[PDB]
Amino acid sequence: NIRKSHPLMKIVNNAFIDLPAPSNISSWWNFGSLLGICLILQILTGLFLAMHYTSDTTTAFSSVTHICRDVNYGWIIRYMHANGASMFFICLYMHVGRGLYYGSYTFLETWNIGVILLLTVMATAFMGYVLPWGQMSFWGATVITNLLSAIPYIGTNLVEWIWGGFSVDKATLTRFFAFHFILPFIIMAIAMVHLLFLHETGSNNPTGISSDVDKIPFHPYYTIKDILGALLLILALMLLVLFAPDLLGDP
Amino acid sequence: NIRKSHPLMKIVNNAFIDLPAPSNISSWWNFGSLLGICLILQILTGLFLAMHYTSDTTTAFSSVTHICRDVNYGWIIRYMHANGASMFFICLYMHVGRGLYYGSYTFLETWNIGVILLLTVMATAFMGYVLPWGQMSFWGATVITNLLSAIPYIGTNLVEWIWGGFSVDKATLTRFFAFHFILPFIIMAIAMVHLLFLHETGSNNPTGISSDVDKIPFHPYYTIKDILGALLLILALMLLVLFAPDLLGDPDNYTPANPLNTPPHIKPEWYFLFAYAILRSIPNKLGGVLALAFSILILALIPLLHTSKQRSMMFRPLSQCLFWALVADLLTLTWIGGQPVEHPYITIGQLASVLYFLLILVLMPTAGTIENKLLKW
Amino acid sequence: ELVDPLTTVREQCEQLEKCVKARERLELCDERVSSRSQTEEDCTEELLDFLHARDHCVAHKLFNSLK
Amino acid sequence: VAPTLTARLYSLLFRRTSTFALTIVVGALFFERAFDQGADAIYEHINEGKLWKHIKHKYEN
Amino acid sequence: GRQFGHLTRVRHVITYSLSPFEQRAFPHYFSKGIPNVLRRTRACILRVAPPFVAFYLVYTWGTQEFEKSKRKNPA
Amino acid sequence: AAKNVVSQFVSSMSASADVLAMSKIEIKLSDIPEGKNMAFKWRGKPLFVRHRTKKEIDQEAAVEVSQLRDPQHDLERVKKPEWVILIGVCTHLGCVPIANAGDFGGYYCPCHGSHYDASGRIRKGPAPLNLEVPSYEFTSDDMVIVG
Amino acid sequence: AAKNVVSQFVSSMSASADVLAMSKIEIKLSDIPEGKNMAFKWRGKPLFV
Amino acid sequence: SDLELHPPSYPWSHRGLLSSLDHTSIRRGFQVYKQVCSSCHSMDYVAYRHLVGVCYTEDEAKALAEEVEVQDGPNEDGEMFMRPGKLSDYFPKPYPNPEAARAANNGALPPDLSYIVRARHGGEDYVFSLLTGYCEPPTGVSLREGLYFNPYFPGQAIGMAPPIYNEVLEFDDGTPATMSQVAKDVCTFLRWAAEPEHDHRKRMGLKMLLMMGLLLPLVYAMKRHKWSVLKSRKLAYRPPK
Amino acid sequence: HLVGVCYTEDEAKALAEEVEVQDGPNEDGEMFMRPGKLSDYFPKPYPN
Ligand SMILES: CCCCCCCCCCCCCCCC(=O)OC[C@H](COP(=O)(O)OCCN)OC(=O)CCCCCCCCCCCCCCC
Ligand SMILES: CCCCCCCCCCCCCCCCCC(=O)OC[C@H](COP(=O)(O)OCCN)OC(=O)CCCCCCCCCCCCC
Ligand code: HEC
Ligand code: HEM
Ligand code: HEM
Ligand code: HEM
Ligand code: HEM
Numbered sequence A: 001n002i003r004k005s006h007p008l009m010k011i012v013n014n015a016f017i018d019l020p021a022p023s024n025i026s027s028w029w030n031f032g033s034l035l036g037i038c039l040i041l042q043i044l045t046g047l048f049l050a051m052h053y054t055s056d057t058t059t060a061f062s063s064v065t066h067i068c069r070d071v072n073y074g075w076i077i078r079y080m081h082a083n084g085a086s087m088f089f090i091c092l093y094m095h096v097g098r099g100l101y102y103g104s105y106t107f108l109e110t111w112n113i114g115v116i117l118l119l120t121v122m123a124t125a126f127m128g129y130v131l132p133w134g135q136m137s138f139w140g141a142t143v144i145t146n147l148l149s150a151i152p153y154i155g156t157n158l159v160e161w162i163w164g165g166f167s168v169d170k171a172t173l174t175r176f177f178a179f180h181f182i183l184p185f186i187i188m189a190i191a192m193v194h195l196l197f198l199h200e201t202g203s204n205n206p207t208g209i210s211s212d213v214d215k216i217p218f219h220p221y222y223t224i225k226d227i228l229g230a231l232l233l234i235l236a237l238m239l240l241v242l243f244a245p246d247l248l249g250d251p
Numbered sequence B: 001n002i003r004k005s006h007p008l009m010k011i012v013n014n015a016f017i018d019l020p021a022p023s024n025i026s027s028w029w030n031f032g033s034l035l036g037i038c039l040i041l042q043i044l045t046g047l048f049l050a051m052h053y054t055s056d057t058t059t060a061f062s063s064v065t066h067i068c069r070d071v072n073y074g075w076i077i078r079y080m081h082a083n084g085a086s087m088f089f090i091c092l093y094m095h096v097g098r099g100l101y102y103g104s105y106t107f108l109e110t111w112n113i114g115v116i117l118l119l120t121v122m123a124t125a126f127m128g129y130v131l132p133w134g135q136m137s138f139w140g141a142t143v144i145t146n147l148l149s150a151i152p153y154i155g156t157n158l159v160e161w162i163w164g165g166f167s168v169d170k171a172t173l174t175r176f177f178a179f180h181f182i183l184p185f186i187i188m189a190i191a192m193v194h195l196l197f198l199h200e201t202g203s204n205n206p207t208g209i210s211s212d213v214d215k216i217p218f219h220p221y222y223t224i225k226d227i228l229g230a231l232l233l234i235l236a237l238m239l240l241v242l243f244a245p246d247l248l249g250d251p252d253n254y255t256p257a258n259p260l261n262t263p264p265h266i267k268p269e270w271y272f273l274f275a276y277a278i279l280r281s282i283p284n285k286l287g288g289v290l291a292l293a294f295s296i297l298i299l300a301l302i303p304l305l306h307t308s309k310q311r312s313m314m315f316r317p318l319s320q321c322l323f324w325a326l327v328a329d330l331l332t333l334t335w336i337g338g339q340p341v342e343h344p345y346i347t348i349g350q351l352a353s354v355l356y357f358l359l360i361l362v363l364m365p366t367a368g369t370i371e372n373k374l375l376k377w
Numbered sequence C: 001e002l003v004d005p006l007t008t009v010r011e012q013c014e015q016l017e018k019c020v021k022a023r024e025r026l027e028l029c030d031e032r033v034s035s036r037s038q039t040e041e042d043c044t045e046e047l048l049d050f051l052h053a054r055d056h057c058v059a060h061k062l063f064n065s066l067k
Numbered sequence D: 001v002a003p004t005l006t007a008r009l010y011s012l013l014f015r016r017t018s019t020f021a022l023t024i025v026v027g028a029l030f031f032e033r034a035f036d037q038g039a040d041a042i043y044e045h046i047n048e049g050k051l052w053k054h055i056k057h058k059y060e061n
Numbered sequence E: 001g002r003q004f005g006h007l008t009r010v011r012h013v014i015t016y017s018l019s020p021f022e023q024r025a026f027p028h029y030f031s032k033g034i035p036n037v038l039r040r041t042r043a044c045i046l047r048v049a050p051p052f053v054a055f056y057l058v059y060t061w062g063t064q065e066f067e068k069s070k071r072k073n074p075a
Numbered sequence F: 001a002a003k004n005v006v007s008q009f010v011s012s013m014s015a016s017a018d019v020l021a022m023s024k025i026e027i028k029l030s031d032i033p034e035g036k037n038m039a040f041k042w043r044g045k046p047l048f049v050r051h052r053t054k055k056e057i058d059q060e061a062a063v064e065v066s067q068l069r070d071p072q073h074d075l076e077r078v079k080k081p082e083w084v085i086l087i088g089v090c091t092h093l094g095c096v097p098i099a100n101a102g103d104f105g106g107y108y109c110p111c112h113g114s115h116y117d118a119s120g121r122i123r124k125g126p127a128p129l130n131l132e133v134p135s136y137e138f139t140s141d142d143m144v145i146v147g
Numbered sequence G: 001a002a003k004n005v006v007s008q009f010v011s012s013m014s015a016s017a018d019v020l021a022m023s024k025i026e027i028k029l030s031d032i033p034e035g036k037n038m039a040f041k042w043r044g045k046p047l048f049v
Numbered sequence H: 001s002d003l004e005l006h007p008p009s010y011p012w013s014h015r016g017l018l019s020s021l022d023h024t025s026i027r028r029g030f031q032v033y034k035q036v037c038s039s040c041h042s043m044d045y046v047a048y049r050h051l052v053g054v055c056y057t058e059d060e061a062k063a064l065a066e067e068v069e070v071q072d073g074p075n076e077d078g079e080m081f082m083r084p085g086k087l088s089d090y091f092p093k094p095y096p097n098p099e100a101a102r103a104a105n106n107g108a109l110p111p112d113l114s115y116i117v118r119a120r121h122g123g124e125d126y127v128f129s130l131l132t133g134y135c136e137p138p139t140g141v142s143l144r145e146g147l148y149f150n151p152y153f154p155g156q157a158i159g160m161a162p163p164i165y166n167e168v169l170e171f172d173d174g175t176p177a178t179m180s181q182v183a184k185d186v187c188t189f190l191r192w193a194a195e196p197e198h199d200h201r202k203r204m205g206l207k208m209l210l211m212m213g214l215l216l217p218l219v220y221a222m223k224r225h226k227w228s229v230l231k232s233r234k235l236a237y238r239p240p241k
Numbered sequence I: 001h002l003v004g005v006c007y008t009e010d011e012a013k014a015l016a017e018e019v020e021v022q023d024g025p026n027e028d029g030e031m032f033m034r035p036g037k038l039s040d041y042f043p044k045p046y047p048n
């Protein structure tokens, strides 16, 4: 009963313990928690990469090599962060595809807040790829940023304003690092409003039929199912990190 | 009515619009919102400073000069961020002093969450001061980080583990930048739990008497009062930024860091001088470091030392005098903290340090008991 | 050849009643320790407090002759 | 001007919120031009010799 | 978070209020305000002032003493 | 598993391979006459190398060792009494003492008032230990290797 | 006031004084025979001559 | 020799709260730095382009940059070479590193001057007093060869010989190059070097005070307007008996 | 980086000492050459 009355634990209880959930949500409903696991994985690995990263164009490339060569287990943190970003997009597209198939988009506020989460994670990962300052990093920044030049009558101003110059240069990389640092924390906050609107209605299920006639508590049924799915996420991540860390990157 | 039913606006309505608030909260209740304004000011200015900052020891000093010389209005953003940090500590100490005088600490969860907010803002500002890599930046990092060496049997390991080496160096500055970036966002989250626990009870007021018989809605009364106070905060900030941007800083910080030579006249920022004075009044290494920590952590004990049967000091003259003896004593330690360790400042700082802990632990609780007996209860 | 304004303002400030006592007490110290055989005392103090009065008077009037 | 000045400003511009906002945005436009003009003329009068635009005539080229 | 209508119990209390467009925002600002500031100052001066006066005297003595000690004395 | 991840993230903060790759220092002893404290750089922090006079060697030799905070005789710190080598970090909180200053004619720390002597031993002030003495040997009469 | 702050933070992102301080390029025309596209560097991006 | 002498307060024309730098004095002060100070002191953070529109025209500042040779390269052969300065170059350093500087100055290191006014207590008051404050040592003070007595320098023994004196340079506008004149101009220039935003910040400060003088009483009036409902409310208690 | 992979510490030290690398400044402000040590990166064949 004390889980229910404490001002802080009542939020945790009504979201992860006593939350009524459908009895029949399939494995496709696991990607919601895996997206949060991915977001927490990227914040931890990313934070430990910023302790040994420099946004100077003349040392940004070398600071990443310094991580993968001299920092104690810096390489494993580095490739978890890179492959974790790819795992993030695997979960995003399955999360979206789940909602399209099963009609979960009829939660308009939750869905529309979802579209915002997709775009910010896309913006976050794009800037992240610019930081190591390789060839694809630079020309990736060149092509995508130049897309704003297509906006009539203000495009070049928006592009040059974003670049901090007449081209992608040192001023562009330093600010992309600041954006890449802070944007994940805004995403975590928006992910809470995502869940806030969801709990108003509770989850959909594979049949698309209301499940109020058959609900089960989130604990212990979906705590352990989410724990099992996380172990499979770690398996998918560690296979890349520990057996093929360059398979998804570009030489 | 739509302000009340929307899942998101209902939180905003029950916190800033229809929130029942006491009709008589004074200007000392304005510092809560000003602390949030300060936190939002530092995040914005700080974020725009990270767009033109490099954590390389060989260019960290020059990247800050590049901001104040070549970046369009980079200097004004820079000095808002520096002076905003000092304004942050002005509001913290008034917010704390408000709660001590008026007995607001009896909200234990809100108070204890408050003590956590004070320590994280202290940790945030300490690391921020290390980033420009001046002389005081480096030797500030040297002295404060070495405090962990006082911890027996693990101290040097904690120090060298934090430094990333046998001394403060490039590895220490790069990580202090990562911590300084992220720690304000954790503070903002903890500030929400601070407000969450507060709204359970609502605000205290100057009389210390329950105000449920006379409540007014937060809007429009305290929205406009908070707006007015913010304009006065901006006035206090812009006077420093636009007329005296170096008054609260140290000139030695405009010389790049040099590990080989320490300046002779070490003077921290003004908001650390009272606690710096407490530490050096104890010559024992571990003893002085524990007294430093206890001079702040003692706030967590203030709720347990409340003896008066009345909550606020408004009706407690004997406690009022001891309260102001604590402010003047803290003003003395701040003064002693800014002077070198020599006669007579050594003995004055020792007497003031004893008076600081003597007031909180002994005199003020005994005054509250004398007052109860004087009122015959 | 060329008259520095600092020269004509310096000696003007020295006739003031406040600092003529400081120059007197400095010339005293010049004669006190010059007489001892082997000592280590010096007149740094008596010189600085003399310059503190003179240089204080120089600043108020000096800048009115410069461009 | 038999009706009060403030009275006529209210009936015409402040009663509706739309025109109350239009008078503000149009006011900030004309206030910005006059405030910066007068503020800069004061900062320049105190410093009449000192500024560069007061010495740019010497350096014709 | 508490809400109006659930705060407490009140009986037999009448409140008269006037619209803000019907009254002055600065009624007798100086003719009545200055006397009130003097009343409040007198009521609290003896509690607040003596501590900081005690600080001022300790501040000046400690600075004077520190200055004289740094000046040398004849042998 | 959880131990291994938390351990690896812990070692990430520990000093990297390049930081641990500190090389020794060649010190030219002909540049240090008597009464001088030449300040070098080693590991980032100062490395004081000092040549002592006979008026200092016998001063520190005769000393009540039982009364010291960190009892250690001057003879068991330096292989050769003429040469003394110290790390220029204060043991209190890491400041750099000013050489040939303080009451004891040794080193004084301006930060909080730690006094040392010609042997580098702590005698007064808040510091709890003698100045660090690195491991060194005199390969010849002109070069000294520190490490 | 709000315009001035938002404007100044906007110009902060605009190219700094040092970036705008781009200097011209001396090109030696004797190094470019017919049928050749010599690639130089100007403003950071290539300058084909 | 741990006694201190603090500098007096000279009435600089930029001392006041709203008072800008004197840009004619800046111009003369740059000439002092170039001709006298630049042979021992670097200024790593000021470039010729920073002069443009402050004390020289673009054409003037370009010609000034072209009066010195600076290193550039590599060329197509991998060699470094010398060219005339341009507006984008920082002021040349006199020495490649501090060790050469100490060796050329009897072991003392002339600091960078970009920030000297802000990195020393007393700013231009200190620098003005130091340059113009040399005198013979007091009785009982005997300085080692190489060092010069100056009572404003900490310790009173400075490794810089007096660098300025009457007619050390000729000013472009004919101003008499007296020691105090040369000191005043070079200090004014060094203030600008350390705080180029000085004039602009003072202009903003004036606008901030005027707007606050408007907004503070108006926002205060909005607070009292709303609160007047409560401040004039009257209460009465009528319980049944 | 070679130590404990394909050479001993003594072997890798001797290997570093087979080349001369630039160091300095000394007390006169001049650069000079010394034998390599374990902390030096492999010499570049060209300056640029
Ligand atoms: C993405 C954007 C994020 C912005 C975050 C800002 C955080 C709030 C910081 C508050 C700063 C106070 C104003 C600085 C004034 C300045 O510095 O302006 C300098 C300008 C002159 O400038 P000029 O001489 O170049 O001539 C300009 C070219 N025509 O006149 C001023 O003084 C105006 C200020 C008046 C006095 C202050 C009144 C405060 C009102 C509060 C409004 C705050 C808006 C909040 C925006 C988020
Ligand atoms: C921590 C390191 C700090 C270092 C900095 C130290 C510098 C201190 C400099 C002095 C600051 C002085 C602030 C101004 C105080 C004014 C006091 C005043 O106006 O009078 C007392 C006032 C009386 O009001 P009552 O509410 O009792 O009754 C009103 C009925 N008309 O009652 C009040 O208004 C009292 C309200 C509480 C005042 C808060 C001041 C706290 C100062 C910092 C405390 C730090 C604690 C760690
Ligand atoms: C070489 C011939 C120099 C000339 C020309 C100038 N300066 Fe100098 N300066 C020089 C040295 C060797 C030193 C180091 C002194 C020491 O003992 O460390 C200095 C130092 C200064 C300082 C710093 C003083 C301080 O408080 O630390 C200043 C402010 C300074 N010098 C000013 C200055 C100016 C304005 C000059 C041109 C008019 C100038 N110096 C010329 C060597 C030389
Ligand atoms: C950072 C990105 C995201 C995170 C962390 C996240 C998290 C979650 C979580 C935890 C749930 C509840 C559990 C579940 O259904 O698995 C959920 C549900 C949902 N999400 Fe997301 N989500 C994200 C992005 C998105 C996006 C991009 C969309 C669509 C464009 C979206 C649409 C939905 C919908 C419709 C549901 C309800 C599903 C149902 O009830 O069946 N989400 N999300
Ligand atoms: C949604 C969250 C995040 C995603 C999807 C993401 C994604 C990425 C990607 C794809 C890269 C490129 C890696 C490479 O090319 O090697 C990267 C790099 C980087 N990221 Fe993140 N990131 C996230 C959050 C963070 C956070 C919170 C931080 C810091 C606190 C951070 C710090 C870094 C750093 C320093 C790099 C450069 C080092 C490197 O290239 O490996 N990231 N990120
Ligand atoms: C980032 C730091 C902080 C922020 C943003 C913050 C914010 C706030 C806000 C908005 C309120 C309600 C409005 C008000 O009373 O002014 C409040 C109340 C309060 N705070 Fe804080 N606070 C912070 C730190 C602290 C600390 C360090 C303490 C104590 C050690 C503390 C103790 C209290 C108490 C006791 C109250 C209730 C006051 C009353 O009801 O009279 N706070 N805080
Ligand atoms: C509670 C919030 C914060 C406080 C109290 C604070 C305080 C400080 C302080 C005292 C300094 C030293 C300034 C100086 O010596 O010049 C500083 C520097 C700095 N801060 Fe913060 N800070 C906060 C938040 C942030 C945030 C959120 C960021 C970035 C997103 C940031 C970025 C920086 C940077 C880049 C510097 C170095 C530039 C400089 O020295 O001015 N800060 N901060």
Ligand SMILES: C[C@@]1(c2ccc(Oc3ccccc3)nc2)OC(=O)N(Nc2ccccc2)C1=O
Binding pocket: B122, B123, B125, B126, B127, B129, B130, B136, B137, B139, B140, B141, B143, B144, B266, B267, B268, B269, B270, B271, B272, B275, B276, B296
């Ligand atoms: C900004 C600053 C700082 C910030 C925050 C900070 O927290 C506290 C504030 C109050 C109480 C407890 C902690 N205490 C110092 O960081 C820093 O290096 N110094 N100066 C410095 C120089 C030498 C030794 C010690 C400090 C500071 O004053």
Ligand code: FES
Binding pocket: F090, F091, F092, F093, F094, F095, F109, F110, F111, F112, F113, F114, F125, F126, F127
């Ligand atoms: S740091 Fe040396 S005495 Fe404290």
Ligand SMILES: [Cl-]
Binding pocket: B061, B064, B065, B132, B253, B254
């Ligand atoms: Cl700086």
